[PDB]
Amino acid sequence: KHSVTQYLEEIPQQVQNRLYTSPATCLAIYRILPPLAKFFIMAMVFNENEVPLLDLDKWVNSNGKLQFQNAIKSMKSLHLLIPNKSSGTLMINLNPTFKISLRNALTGGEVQNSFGVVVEENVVSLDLLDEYSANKWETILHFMVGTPLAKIPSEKVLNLLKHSKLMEEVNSTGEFKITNEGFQFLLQEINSQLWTLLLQYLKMIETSKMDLVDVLHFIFMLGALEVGKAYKIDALSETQRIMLQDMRDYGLVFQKHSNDSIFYPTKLALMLTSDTKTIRGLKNQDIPDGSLIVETNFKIYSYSNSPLQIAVLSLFVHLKARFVNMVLGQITRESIRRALTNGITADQIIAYLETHAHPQMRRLAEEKLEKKLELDPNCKEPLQVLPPTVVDQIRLWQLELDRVITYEGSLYSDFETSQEYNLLSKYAQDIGVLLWKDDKKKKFFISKEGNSQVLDFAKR
């Protein structure tokens, strides 16, 4: 996942505050900050005064303070606040546009972009207008990953996928195939995928007539609430309505028929952030309508199915003869080698199998789960949750398709005595932050969680 949060901080301070102009986008940016950061926002939203850091440091006691550093670092990067070396101390206060737009949007304020929705006869039924949007996703997804029929008609979407290199498919040849980016599309399920595409279109639709605050105000307007009436008609900008209609065409606006009506607030705008329940001629057997087969014998036992889904399954397994309930396919090191040929690491597929194919592997996963976590310290042998035998073959296959390694962090120095390095190393394993070390070199290339706490303990 590109972690779109890192994009909001990347946009400079003003366009954030420009973004922060709508109490909608004040109230919006608030829910993604880490819970420590959330707690430090609202305090100083209302008490109209800055606060010394010593109090904010004394507010957070021992471990959990790492989230206190997690809170403050994400806080500053997107500049919703202003640190102030006023008298050599640290005077913490919101980027005031955030706090009051929040406070306004808190106490019924002037978020008119937030209040841009309209309430009318909400004729959009629970089943109505999102099956198109759900089918919109189904057709384009079959198009993008490559279905038997790639019914994705989003020309603006297709250019973004090829132009953003969303799928490692030959856009010049029309190929919609899974590359490293296309493999990543197969990993980020609802948020992350809904995150990933929102980034490609922003990169694609960023040359002319962006109006990002309006784009972000319009994006946050359609996903913030069911604009319902007057969303695509009134509560939408010129480029925003084109984005709303483009979001309408992409399904992300379930823009009702006539192309000129209230914001068809499809559920697709909801899922991009909700990170909650995901279930969307006149027949749609669900929810467990999908099916697959993954067991200890390393074989597909398919009884339920879905074409694009089994097309996706076939992207890493041979298909031989689709039967009444089963598709003749057997997962092997050769079968995953179809994806390793594409450079697809055996990493996201790990999380994929534990989540996907479950509608047929419910009992199989449920029998695998066994609740062997409270029994884990009791019966020290976990009962095959989650299946480890597959991943080692994947890892060994990945190791067979491997031999490049690298690490993150930063090399560290000025470790003067062995006691501090020994004491720092000993505490590091307590919280788990040290990749590799050596007393001989007094150097290691890891995160700075070790450096921040020794400085904080020494300084305060």
Added chain:
Amino acid sequence: PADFVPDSVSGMFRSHDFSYLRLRPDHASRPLWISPSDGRIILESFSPLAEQAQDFLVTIAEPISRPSHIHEYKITAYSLYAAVSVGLETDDIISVLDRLSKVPVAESIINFIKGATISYGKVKLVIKHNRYFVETTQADILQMLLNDSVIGPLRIDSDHQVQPPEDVLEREEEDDDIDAVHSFEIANESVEVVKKRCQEIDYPVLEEYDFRNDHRNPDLDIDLKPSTQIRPYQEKSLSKMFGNGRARSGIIVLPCGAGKTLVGITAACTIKKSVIVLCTSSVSVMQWRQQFLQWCTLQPENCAVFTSDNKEMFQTESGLVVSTYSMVANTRNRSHDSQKVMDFLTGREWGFIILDEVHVVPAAMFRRVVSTIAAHAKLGLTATLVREDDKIGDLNFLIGPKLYEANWMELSQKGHIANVQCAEVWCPMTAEFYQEYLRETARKRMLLYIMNPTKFQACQFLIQYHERRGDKIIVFSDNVYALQEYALKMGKPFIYGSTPQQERMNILQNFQYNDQINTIFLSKVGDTSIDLPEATCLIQISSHYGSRRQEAQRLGRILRAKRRNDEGFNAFFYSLVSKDTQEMYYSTKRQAFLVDQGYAFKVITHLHGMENIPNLAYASPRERRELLQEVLLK
């Protein structure tokens, strides 16, 4: 000519469609889902009669999958005949299948199951006076027997005799069809021709085995003591061949090296009647008589071993007998000891015949130890599911029905076999091997990854390890130089390439009784064959050793049994492979074999003290390169 697909017709009936093949109407309300086209029968957790369903499938067919959620279905003609010989109602199985199997019973599948239940023999081989004759319960049976050259022409005109049917059953036809019908007593000579003509004319005969028409005389010098080793698959295999009440010899496909003769000695003793034992070769007759039959209850004073180079006491041997095929019939009919034993074999009436690996030697001589004598029983302790003696008149329908088959899950799991551990170490890669891999695509890379001095090291760790544990180590290394280079690198009294058998035996004596030498290296000369030594820690280096049927053999052959339980995995199987070399494909081929064999298996590439072992000779990539140059010579 004389070949029958029905015995070996297993391996089909797995192909369906989606347009023509509809979802089974039971699919809504059916505990199973019989995929008839795919031949698969998935017995999910929803089947209440899953145990009842599981047994029925195992009879008529072979359950390929036994998954925790659902099982798997496969078709076996021998199973179909065996499930036909199972006796379950063909219609009754189908309906409980149809009601249970949500997938509707396939039309082809339904016909085969009914064809199993009734066919797999509709023959009419009648019997008279508690014996076998040329007759039939059905009419097409009496026609087959009377118009038979062996059944009819070899059949005496007498309808039946209590003693003649008792004695002669034109050999022993203790495998006939339904008796107590119209038939005539057959002679004492030659059911080869009986079976060789039902062979030529394709008479699948619904056969039985009348096990106390395994009577055959006043009681022989048999010591009915069960002191011979008993362990659980043998007894329920016996319980299958002992059936209801009294000893029936069936066909019980048993392995040589897991107490095969033990069921035969018991069934021979149980009948309390004259019995002969036939093993592969005379030299194996002594080996078999040596390595178990004195641990067994058998007193070899009675068991005259015969070679016709080995004259022994024929026609005076008071108790049971152990002879061998090439003796009992062959071009190797080579002193009148042989014939006179056979003259005695015909002379004395024998109740039971224990047979060991009849398949290797042509059935024609077995058909000639089935041409002359007319015992009452045999016992086919076969070793392979499909054999060159699978003629359309199978040796199953001359000894007794199948009681023991490829379903070696019911029986050995009852407590016979111990735990066997298998492992596959990935020897680390070093540039030259790959440069050696790069330069030649040929198979000559074989020893080029075998030589890996790191591979020597891991071996030595096991050596010090199993020496520390007082354990025993088998290494399977067919190289000569790098093995010598390694045996030189270890420096223990070592069995190696072309090891002197006395030195082999000396090292073996210094290996199993003495724990100082706790590492021997078995080259390709171990199989086949030596009297293979006991397996606690098997290491295998060479992995071509084709074909793979041998790799089943070696795995079975090299992993011998161990009466040591000090170690938690008393049969280690190891395979030192240079990772990233030519046999990663073939090392991956061995792993799938073992897990199909079911041996407990693992991978240990994070060796405890891998570089901490003694004798890091050639450890460096340079010396691995240097030994790689050393082995490019080989």
